Design a binder for this molecule. Structure first.
Ligand SMILES: C=CCN(C)C/C=C/COc1cc2c(cc1F)c(-c1ccc(Br)cc1)nn2C
Ligand SMILES: C=CCN(C)C/C=C/COc1cc2c(cc1F)c(-c1ccc(Br)cc1)nn2C
Ligand SMILES: CCCCCCCCOCCOCCOCCOCCO
Ligand SMILES: CCCCCCCCOCCOCCOCCOCCO
Lengths: 619, 619
């Protein structure tokens, strides 16, 4: 019955695998990426007409009926995303007259205009001279003087926000302006009678920070800024020391773009760092079959490879499959062996974690590391020496990354500072990197394969963390994945592998929750709105991945041989495509709860296989 | 008569010109370059058998009868050069038994052995574990803390030594050891009864520095070095900020090699700076027709192009020659417009100088700048706008570079500190960059073309400098060129263009000197020994370049229509090759008086043409 489904899904994943022996599917987000890229070229005075066209097709394509752009497919119209997309188009050639511009422009006005956009949006528009810097949250370079154990030090922010703050400090220090041609001027973004509904800080704004910001802008007008010269250099060197091998910064788009801009402001366009940092963009770019072009906010080569292996293994393929070996070998060469920003909190910790993308040694995450190691622990490589040693290194690294609450963060340890969540600047997505449920689960899921049970303290502390974080309805929040079906499925799956009894009360209360949200079509679905409105928790169009997750939660809970269980399996078997793949016009990945959403392409193929793989094990 | 010589010499230079429209002839030095390169690969664990072979052929080829290696062709056997060459060979595969090794080894012993080699030689041998660091001049990273106006600050050294000191400070801070295979161990370098004749500091060694060094080695053994961590980072960032575009450091081999080593010691082999810095070496490498391979200590693309243009112009080719335009355009794109280490002494000075090699923005020299600008002032480019503006920028830069004594240095201003010339480490070549005669002359020669005469103060101050530096025999020392025939020819040529009366006493006393050294073959020659023994001042085998220089000194002095004048011309006309070129098995370039000698390939073709060009003008 489901056998044919697996055999087809298996041969498919194996066909998507590259020559090197790894998997790498595109990462979807929103048009703000391409929109900002267009402006970046303008700033760097490196515009390519041919490329612009590919970007124009893309922008319009992603535009919906109403003429707006959302963070995720089938989501509400996002102001910011639309504003940036609007400016980009008009700059490429579009005229405010054309219908696509009309519907979009009207929407921007019906929301208060530019005065209702995030800081970033207003910042870029400020970089082009379409918005005064005076009304933009100030971030002085002096922040580089804050010691290791002081309030608001660059090391109290999230690895992702950190690099951005350091890069921007230099940019905002000079407050450069790169005028746009009269033909691109977008003053209409102001014409509006609707009251400006500005967005406050993530965790709220205190009068202190509000005043401090006003003070900075004032000090920013003085004729002499003592030690600011060194302050900037401190930021410049900081970046130069942590530049990714591919030329990026952190492997993400934000700091990368701002870093280049910072270098441009310092007349370092002929410096190796800049050269490399620029030509490295092409790697993240993608050619769309319909003549479009997009820029991935990031790449998941390692991540895809990791999951893919686990999926195929749990499916049936031998532990020494010559094709899987290509991956095992590849992964081993990805392991990081040099201290990163994480060392600041764990100096006596030996490097051994992996990154998300190709080359990003200074920012290895716990999630990838856990998956990669666990993926290798299920393979038989010709050289049991490096495989045995690699796992050990990564294993110990993870253990040394466990926070105080027993949980595991993503990049840093105990990075739970609540100060940066009030700064006027920080008003989009997360700013800190505190321990999460999903990540922790994946960690326990890793140790489980080795045998380590609840007897080991480290495991217990983690379990306690999960128990205290479990939601009232017995569900678990999803940090890097939409959403509760993702978290719950991850936790239960982990707790089952760590030895914990699946008959436990809180456990059962979780499984029941899963069956209570099984859509009519037999599949499971959870829209991204679950982050904004709780009424969507477990609700939404069914998807191959989400269905697989909620499916694993049952298979692990022992309800693999149940009604709702066989029900979901039927969905995956039917919805499957002739080629053995799966479609998924909805995002299932999460970057920032209610701010940034991602769409992992492989998820629709990997997980569905992993789910069926474990289902074929219960029998 | 000489017409045919010119027409042939002209069509030749035009054939050597590359497509881009520039000239670039190889730069010769000694085997220490390749020798150290071999060790570099060992250190970086990146050895290429195929390449090693090409290096072996080269080494042996450059070895003379006695089995030694000299700094220049036909020069005395150099210990250092031989030692490093010996170690390199034995590492490639050579056995201490083979004749080439025997004769070389014996020479090394007959000089005291390794204990009689320069600091660098002993340093590399220390990097491979063949020499104890304890007996190597210490250079602590703490030197990076010395302010701008303090004793022995990195900015008191020569631009070339500076980068080296900063890079090595990190290397010597860790004193790393990279063991050589037992087959390459070179203990025989110690077996010697001859007393070790060590080389002292350039300007002598004071008991202070001698003691200070002993103190450092002691402090180097302690268990805790406070602030040394930051001291290193200060050096690391310093390098990262000034890395050449081609991936080098200063455009020279020394700092480049040590910089890479430093990065390797910091586990930054996967950092962009390193990657770029490594793959950039190939650009300086050269494939020898006889299967050999060499590494240019530096490249003279800009320098060659500059002189070549002036030569062809003074020859007869139109000021708008379509072929010369290719150069004019190319040169304009080479002009630097960003602050360099020179800004430390001249913050209010606008960038406009040029570099010696392709991409080296942070180290523009006065010599090249003067030549390039002066070369453009004799051309008619389609865009008189950038040509007029370029000259102005470079012109003003040079003026702002004039030292206190009215003379012009090479890279920095008033860099005449006499403190670094006593440090135990500095014992090879120059360490500072004080004003020179040749450079200054070239500067005046530049202004002269514009019209600025002795009336202008800046010119006068320069002339006074030259007058006070003129040697007793009415000759002028040659800093970057062997030697007195080079300096004298440069000065007289300049003083003639600045309006100064060529009938002047000190002037005539110079011309007479030239005629008094005209070899019987009608040509002029000056061996490099002129730096060690004064009895060689103006003596040595005649060469196309040197003959041309001493020839210009006469043509400028008004003695163009003299006996010795027409005599030299005859030499150039006869010694000329069928293809219109010229041979020169002797070096005429100078890096460090009595330490490092260079051989500019184009010199044998350019100058000879320039000389004949000006000779055809006197008539
Ligand atoms: C579970 C998988 C691995 N796990 C470890 C999550 C990491 C995913 C890497 O991809 C991204 C990470 C990002 C981002 C985007 C990614 F695609 C941003 C980000 C996005 C927009 C703005 Br504005 C600022 C930051 N921050 N961070 C950490
Ligand atoms: C008159 C021509 C231009 N003028 C401006 C001289 C510059 C020549 C560039 O070539 C070199 C410069 C060098 C060196 C080598 C070159 F080929 C070294 C050097 C060599 C050996 C060691 Br050991 C240390 C330094 N230092 N410096 C400045
Ligand atoms: C990053 C702070 C920007 C301040 C730059 C002003 C530079 C002042 O030049 C003084 C002399 O130092 C020369 C160095 O330039 C080398 C590269 O360093 C990068 C930014 O200039
Ligand atoms: C240049 C200092 C050498 C000290 C090396 C110890 C490495 C520990 O790093 C401390 C943690 O800071 C995180 C940064 O790593 C970035 C790259 O800088 C390169 C070498 O330090």
């Amino acid at each position: 019955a489901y056998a044919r489904t697996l055999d087809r899904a298996v041969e498919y994943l194996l066909s998507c695998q590259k020559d090197e022996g790894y998997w790498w599917g595109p990462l979807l987000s929103n048009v703000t990426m391409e929109a900002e890229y267009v402006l970046l070229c303008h700033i760097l005075d490196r515009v390519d007409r041919d490329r612009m066209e590919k970007i124009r097709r893309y922008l319009l394509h992603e535009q919906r009926e109403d003429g707006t752009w959302a963070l995720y497919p089938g989501g509400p119209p996002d102001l910011d995303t639309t504003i940036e997309a609007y400016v980009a188009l008009k700059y490429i050639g579009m005229s405010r007259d054309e219908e696509p511009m009309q519907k979009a422009l009207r929407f921007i006005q019906s929301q208060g205009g530019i005065e209702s956009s995030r800081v970033f949006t207003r910042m870029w528009l400020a970089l082009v001279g379409e918005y005064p810097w005076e009304k933009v949250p100030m971030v002085p370079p002096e922040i580089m003087f804050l010691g290791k154990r002081m309030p608001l030090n660059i090391y109290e922010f999230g690895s992702w926000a950190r690099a951005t703050v350091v890069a921007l400090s230099i940019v905002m220090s000079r407050q450069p302006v790169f005028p746009l041609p009269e033909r691109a001027r977008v003053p209409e973004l102001y014409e509006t009678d609707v009251p400006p509904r500005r967005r406050g800080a993530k965790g709220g704004g205190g009068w202190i920070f509000d005043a401090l910001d006003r003070a900075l802008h004032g000090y920013q007008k003085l004729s002499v800024h003592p030690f600011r010269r060194a302050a900037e250099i401190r930021a410049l060197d900081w970046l130069l020391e942590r530049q990714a091998g591919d030329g990026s910064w952190g492997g993400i788009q934000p700091p990368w773009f701002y870093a280049l801009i910072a270098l441009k402001i310092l007349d370092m366009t002929q410096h190796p760092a800049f050269i490399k940092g620029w030509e490295g963009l092409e790697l993240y770019g993608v050619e769309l079959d319909y003549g479009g072009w997009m820029f991935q906010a990031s790449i998941s080569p390692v991540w895809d490879t990791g999951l893919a292996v686990l999926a195929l293994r749990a499916a049936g393929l031998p532990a020494d499959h010559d094709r899987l070996v290509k991956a095992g070998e590849w992964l081993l060469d990805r392991q990081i062996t040099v201290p990163g920003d994480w060392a600041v909190k764990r100096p006596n910790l030996k490097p051994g974690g992996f990154a998300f993308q190709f080359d990003n040694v200074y920012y290895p995450d716990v999630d990838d590391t856990a998956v990669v190691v666990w993926a290798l622990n299920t393979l038989r490589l010709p050289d049991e020496r490096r495989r045995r040693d690699a796992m050990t290194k990564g294993f110990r690294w993870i253990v040394g990354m466990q926070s105080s609450n027993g949980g595991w963060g993503a990049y840093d340890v105990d990075n739970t500072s609540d100060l940066p969540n009030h700064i006027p600047f920080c008003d989009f997505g997360e700013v800190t990197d505190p321990p999460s449920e999903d990540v922790t689960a994946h960690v326990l899921e890793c140790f489980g394969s080795f045998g380590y049970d609840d007897a080991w303290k480290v495991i217990r502390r983690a379990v306690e963390y999960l128990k205290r974080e479990q939601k009232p309805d017995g569900s678990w929040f999803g940090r890097w994945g939409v959403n509760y079906l993702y978290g719950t499925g991850a936790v239960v799956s982990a707790l089952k592998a760590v030895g914990i009894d699946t008959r436990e009360p809180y456990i059962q209360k979780a499984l029941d929750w899963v069956e209570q949200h099984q859509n009519p079509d037999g599949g499971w679905g959870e829209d991204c709105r679950s982050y904004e409105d709780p009424a969507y928790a477990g609700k939404g169009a069914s998807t191959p991945s989400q269905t697989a997750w909620a499916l694993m939660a049952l298979i692990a809970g022992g309800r693999a041989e149940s009604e709702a269980a066989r029900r979901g399996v039927q969905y995956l078997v039917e919805t499957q495509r002739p080629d053995g793949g799966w479609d998924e016009p909805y995002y299932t990945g999460t970057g920032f709860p209610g701010d940034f959403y991602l769409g992992y392409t492989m998820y629709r193929h990997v997980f569905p296989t992993l789910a069926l793989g474990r289902y074929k094990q219960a029998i």
